[PDB]
Write a protein that binds this ligand. Structure first.
Ligand SMILES: [Mg+2]
Ligand SMILES: [Mg+2]
Ligand SMILES: [Mg+2]
Ligand SMILES: [Mg+2]
Ligand SMILES: [Mg+2]
Ligand SMILES: [Mg+2]
Ligand SMILES: [Mg+2]
Ligand SMILES: [Mg+2]
Ligand SMILES: [Mg+2]
Ligand SMILES: [Mg+2]
Ligand SMILES: [Mg+2]
Ligand SMILES: [Mg+2]
Ligand SMILES: [Mg+2]
Ligand SMILES: [Mg+2]
Ligand SMILES: [Mg+2]
Ligand SMILES: [Mg+2]
Ligand SMILES: [Mg+2]
Ligand SMILES: [Mg+2]
Ligand SMILES: [Mg+2]
Ligand SMILES: [Mg+2]
Ligand SMILES: [Mg+2]
Ligand SMILES: [Mg+2]
Ligand SMILES: [Mg+2]
Ligand SMILES: [Mg+2]
Ligand SMILES: [Mg+2]
Ligand SMILES: [Mg+2]
Ligand SMILES: [Mg+2]
Ligand SMILES: [Mg+2]
Ligand SMILES: [Mg+2]
Ligand SMILES: [Mg+2]
Ligand SMILES: [Mg+2]
Ligand SMILES: [Mg+2]
Ligand SMILES: [Mg+2]
Ligand SMILES: [Mg+2]
Ligand SMILES: [Mg+2]
Ligand SMILES: [Mg+2]
Ligand SMILES: [Mg+2]
Ligand SMILES: [Mg+2]
Ligand SMILES: [Mg+2]
Ligand SMILES: [Mg+2]
Ligand SMILES: [Mg+2]
Ligand SMILES: [Mg+2]
Ligand SMILES: [Zn+2]
Lengths: 127, 83, 61, 206, 60, 97, 23, 155
RNA sequence: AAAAAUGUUCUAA
RNA sequence: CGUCGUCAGCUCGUGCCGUGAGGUGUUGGGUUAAGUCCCGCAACGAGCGCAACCCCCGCCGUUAGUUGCCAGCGGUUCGGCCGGGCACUCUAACGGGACUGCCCGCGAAAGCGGGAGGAAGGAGGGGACGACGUCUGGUCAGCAUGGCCCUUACGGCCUGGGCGACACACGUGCUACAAUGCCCACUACAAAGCGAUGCCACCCGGCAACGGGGAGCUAAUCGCAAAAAGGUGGGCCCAGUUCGGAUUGGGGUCUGCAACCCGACCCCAUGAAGCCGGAAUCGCUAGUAAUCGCGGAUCAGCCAUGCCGCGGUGAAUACG
């Protein structure tokens, strides 16, 4: 009666709950499209069940805290895919090759002393 | 400026000089190191010798300089320009 | 409120009184330098105006 | 000059702190200054004993200075009277309950701080500096250590042109963290000036 | 003008404003950390010595 | 019957935690296992050199690890025994109702 | 403009508050 | 690069048209990371081209891009001590990228106020072989035709 | 198959 | 401590060659980010370096469940709030995990190319780590220290002044020249840190800095807290402007014994230069650059647009 996937991306954690239903999505009690309103990277967070024709097959009850709105998006993308194999493991092919089962570890590189950001350097002026 | 919750600032010792001079039928030369003291209406007519760090510059105080500190009339930097 | 021409009278006469009494800001407004504690080694270009470039010290050969 | 201090580099892997205790923000320094004031006192008093490492523990109103010394007998004095002349003068500075303990060191020539002081004392008695280095490194290898390096910087033999001298036997991997490397420095001070004595004893990887 | 200044720094001032911190170990008046009573140099020396309880070279 | 332990060394903080929750696990009832509260890290970034060399530092940090231990029922057979326990040096204990 | 203390943007840049960045 | 080539970064197809070409384009509109702003600009322009001359805009967009791809461009070489204008053909990758670059670039030249109008109107002109990004592409191809004498210096 | 001149005195530790 | 230079190097013991300096080894074939490995060889080993061990980040586990968390039943002033629970998220310690281990191909080998599994693959990303030495590099002003020098003074206290000067010149930056923008209002999503004459919830005063009240918090509990770009809605309409916020007049706020020289801030007014910058020149190869905000050290206050960190959004291109 319930299927779960954990989505992590860039300090943004996601607890997505795949439950059967007409298709509706919720995020932190707010509806999806009320939460990522006018954020065109919206539908990428649901693309998992576009490679597995379950768009309207599940409702989803999602939670995200930390990171940022797009950081949560790829975390929702990862959990929705994570829950689908947790629903059935036959789904793994058509999900793993499409990069859905992997978690991109691209995090902000730490600032380093003598520099202005991770690698941006103070302007060189010989004399 | 000095927060007017607190008063207007005289070092108290320089004030003693002002009013000791008032009650005596002033004036007299008033040397001071209190550039940080406000000009106060009891000073008009006096000539207060202000120390710029080097010399004690005299300053005759008129009614139209009461809002200011005494160091505004003894400048600390000799300049003359470049040439 | 007092405006256009009149306002500028009370601005001018105030600066005037600053220069008249010998206030340090009056010395500042005389020589046309900053009055609010800014440094003048570099910049102050608004208050001083276009750079009157001069020759400099010479290195040895 | 470009080399990390081998102890600071290892603290938490090979090396435990000389002073270990907890203290909140409001009196970390007070406990630190009292320790610095204690260690100096003993590093002045127990210098004639061959003091190698002062351990200072702290809990509540009582400080437990476990001092490590080559010759413990010259510290304790007569059956515990010099140890008592200090267990008191320590408490006179501690104000607390000063627990002063003495510890036997296995082989002093396996103690980098000691050897560093010996070479420092030797070139204070105007010895051959180069020879004093080869002498030292040798005593350490004999004493079983897996490697030793001894460095002297300064006006070696009073020469106006200052200079570094060193020797090393066995391995001394300074970049290896599992390598137990006792570091010790002693400062030689002579008529012509001041000289630096760095001792690196490889005890063996763990 | 060091020792008299390591001394005067201690002595309680005429005004709390003149209160400035000063290293306990070397007497440096700049880059002095409240937490240790030391300066940034002495901080590095005592640390490397292991005489600074609980502080290690950070990396991340 | 709450007890919170602090210290810089986390190795001793953990052995000084389990030595407590193993104690009150002698005279029951239950204890609430040692939760690790978040570490409070105090950094220090100082110039590596004593002079002028600004763009080269060395990072240090002071780690103040945190553990909480709760013994659910009082039972004075440990509210006497815990006082007879051996907690290492760099461990500070706070015990609350 | 961050340099404009007279707007919400300038008060954010100096991290101060006022009629132009009310808290 | 010195050791090996650069591996061309593959982009995620955009969520409206499913096109990597749209994505690279929106990335060329983007400044300071404000992608969604650049997403709105490309998409609000996509509407306008579906209005003015009602056509499937993705087809118009790909006619602009196609009509801006430069097939040749001069490049400097060396032999002895020279720095010629060597006419060398353009790799299909650099073909696309110069288009996308000059597209946005010449579009931002245009005088209409808001961006999507500037983007839409250039893609309308460039899909018909007019406007800035064309006059640049054609001009580049012109200079290469000129220096066809230094073509024997092609590697 | 090569656009472009020069570097004060003693000391080289 | 900087530097060359995270560059792949620098050497030693013995043996061999050479009258000797010195040579060999350390060269040569291939390979690697690497003197990295392999093969060869009058060389055979060794050491300082390189890699590794260590720290953060990415996947899973184990042990943990309050101050953290709420999946599901119970209530519910509808706020995880109370029952209860630790599943999840998390917090934080200990583990596991990738080894070119597997396949195909090449190869003498080392490896290299590609494919599989996998969260991760070729050193996964980032840090810490800097060889022999070089620059008579830097620091006697952090400290130490030899010598030279001063001794009612070159020592010491104090008050004021100066380190903030300004015809000029350079370096590093902050803010801009605008519409992919500016402005008001509403509305979202961070991490890392700090906090007991400390952080200040909330309340009234004030246009506002702030003031006065006034809880909580020795802090996964109370607070700093608003994150901002963003989203939504409206205004401006190409103007030296609703761009820009310098300069200056006035009016205050606070810290402080004291803001004249010489503090920050707040309100009214003022509203400069600047329409994208000559010769020339800098940084960056990916969660980088670019942009956006946040915190800390020092600190009464603060001239911080600086420094060290933190996350948000997030590109372009590498033929060679
Ligand atoms: Mg984390
Ligand atoms: Mg960033
Ligand atoms: Mg000035
Ligand atoms: Mg001194
Ligand atoms: Mg002070
Ligand atoms: Mg200080
Ligand atoms: Mg710098
Ligand atoms: Mg801006
Ligand atoms: Mg020539
Ligand atoms: Mg000549
Ligand atoms: Mg030989
Ligand atoms: Mg021979
Ligand atoms: Mg030889
Ligand atoms: Mg060989
Ligand atoms: Mg050789
Ligand atoms: Mg070589
Ligand atoms: Mg060689
Ligand atoms: Mg050779
Ligand atoms: Mg390398
Ligand atoms: Mg290494
Ligand atoms: Mg559990
Ligand atoms: Mg020199
Ligand atoms: Mg000296
Ligand atoms: Mg000195
Ligand atoms: Mg200065
Ligand atoms: Mg200039
Ligand atoms: Mg700046
Ligand atoms: Mg500049
Ligand atoms: Mg602070
Ligand atoms: Mg704040
Ligand atoms: Mg104007
Ligand atoms: Mg103009
Ligand atoms: Mg305007
Ligand atoms: Mg404005
Ligand atoms: Mg004013
Ligand atoms: Mg001032
Ligand atoms: Mg314009
Ligand atoms: Mg430009
Ligand atoms: Mg690189
Ligand atoms: Mg401050
Ligand atoms: Mg200023
Ligand atoms: Mg700041
Ligand atoms: Zn110091």
């Amino acid at each position: 009666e319930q299927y779960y996937g954990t989505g992590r991306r860039k300090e943004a954690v996601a607890r997505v709950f795949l439950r059967p239903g007409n298709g509706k999505v919720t995020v932190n009690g707010q509806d999806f499209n009320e939460y990522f309103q006018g954020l065109v990277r919206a539908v990428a967070a649901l693309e998992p069940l576009r490679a597995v024709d379950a768009l309207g097959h599940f409702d989803a009850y999602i939670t995200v805290r930390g990171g940022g709105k797009s950081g949560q998006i790829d975390a929702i993308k990862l959990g929705i895919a994570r829950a689908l194999v947790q629903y059935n493991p036959d789904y793994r092919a058509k999900l793993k090759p499409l990069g859905f089962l992997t978690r991109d570890a691209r995090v902000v590189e730490r600032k380093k002393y003598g520099k202005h950001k991770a690698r941006r350097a103070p302007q060189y002026s010989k004399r | 400026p000095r927060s007017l919750k607190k008063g207007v600032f005289v070092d108290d010792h320089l004030l003693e000089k002002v009013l000791e001079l008032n009650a005596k039928g002033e004036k007299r030369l008033i040397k001071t190191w209190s550039r940080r003291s406000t000009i106060v209406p009891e000073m008009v007519g006096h000539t207060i010798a202000v120390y710029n760090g080097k010399q004690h510059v005299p300053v005759y105080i008129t009614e139209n300089m009461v809002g200011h500190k005494l160091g505004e009339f003894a400048p600390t930097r000799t300049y003359r320009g470049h040439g | 409120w007092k405006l256009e021409g009149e306002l500028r009278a009370e601005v001018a006469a105030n600066i005037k009184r600053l220069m008249d009494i010998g206030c340090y800001r009056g010395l500042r407004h005389r020589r046309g330098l900053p009055v609010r504690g800014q440094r003048t080694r570099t910049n102050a270009r608004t208050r001083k105006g276009p750079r009157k470039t001069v020759a400099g010290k010479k290195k040895a050969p | 000059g470009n080399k990390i201090h081998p102890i600071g580099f290892r603290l938490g892997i090979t090396r435990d702190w000389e002073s270990r205790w907890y203290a909140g923000k409001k009196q970390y320094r007070h406990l630190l200054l009292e320790d610095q004031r204690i260690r100096g006192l003993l590093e002045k008093e127990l210098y004639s004993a061959g003091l190698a490492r002062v351990d200072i523990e702290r809990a509540a109103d009582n400080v437990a200075v476990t001092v490590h010394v080559a010759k413990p007998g010259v510290v304790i004095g007569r059956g515990g009277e010099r140890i008592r002349v200090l267990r008191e003068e320590l408490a006179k500075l501690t104000g607390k309950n000063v627990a002063l303990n003495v510890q036997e060191v296995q082989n002093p020539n396996l103690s980098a701080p000691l050897v560093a002081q010996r070479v420092a004392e030797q070139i204070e008695r105007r010895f051959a500096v180069r020879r004093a280095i080869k002498q030292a490194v040798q005593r350490v290898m004999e004493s079983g250590a897996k490697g030793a390096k001894v460095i002297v910087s300064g006006r070696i033999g009073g020469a106006e042109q200052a200079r570094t001298e060193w020797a090393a036997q066995g391995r001394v991997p300074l970049h290896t963290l599992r390598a137990n490397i006792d570091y010790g420095f002693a400062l030689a001070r002579t008529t012509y000036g001041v000289l630096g004595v760095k001792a690196y004893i490889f005890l063996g990887e763990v | 003008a060091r020792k008299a200044l390591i001394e005067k720094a201690k002595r309680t001032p005429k005004f709390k404003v003149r209160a400035y911190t000063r290293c306990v170990r070397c007497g440096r008046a700049r880059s002095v950390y409240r937490f240790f009573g030391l300066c940034r140099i002495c901080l590095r020396e005592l640390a490397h010595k292991g005489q600074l309880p609980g502080v290690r070279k950070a990396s991340w | 019957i709450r007890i919170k332990l602090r210290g810089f060394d986390h190795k001793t903080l953990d052995a000084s935690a389990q030595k407590i929750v193993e104690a009150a696990r002698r005279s029951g009832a239950q204890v609430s296992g040692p939760i690790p509260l978040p570490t409070r890290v105090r950094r220090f970034t100082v110039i590596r050199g004593p002079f002028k060399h600004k763009d080269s530092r060395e990072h240090f940090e002071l780690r103040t690890h945190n553990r909480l231990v709760d013994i659910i029922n009082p039972n004075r057979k440990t509210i006497e025994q815990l006082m007879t326990l051996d907690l290492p040096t760099g461990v500070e204990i706070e015990i609350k109702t | 403009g961050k340099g404009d203390r007279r707007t919400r943007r300038g008060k954010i840049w100096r991290g101060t508050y006022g009629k132009y960045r009310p808290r | 690069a010195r050791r090996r080539r650069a591996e061309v970064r593959q982009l995620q197809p955009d969520l409206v048209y499913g096109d990597v070409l749209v994505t690279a384009f929106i990335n060329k509109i983007m400044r300071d990371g404000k992608k969604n702003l650049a997403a709105r600009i490309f998409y609000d322009a996509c509407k306008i081209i579906q209005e003015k001359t009602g056509q499937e805009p993705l087809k118009v967009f790909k006619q602009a891009v196609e009509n801006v791809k430069p097939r040749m461009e001069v490049r400097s070489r060396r032999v002895g001590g020279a720095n010629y204008q060597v006419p060398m053909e353009v790799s299909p990758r650099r073909q696309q990228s110069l288009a996308l670059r000059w597209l946005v670039q010449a579009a931002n030249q245009r005088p209409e106020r808001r961006a999507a109008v500037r983007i839409a109107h250039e893609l309308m002109d460039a899909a018909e072989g007019k406007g800035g990004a064309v006059k640049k592409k054609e001009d580049v191809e012109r200079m290469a035709e000129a220096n066809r004498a230094y073509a024997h210096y092609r590697w």
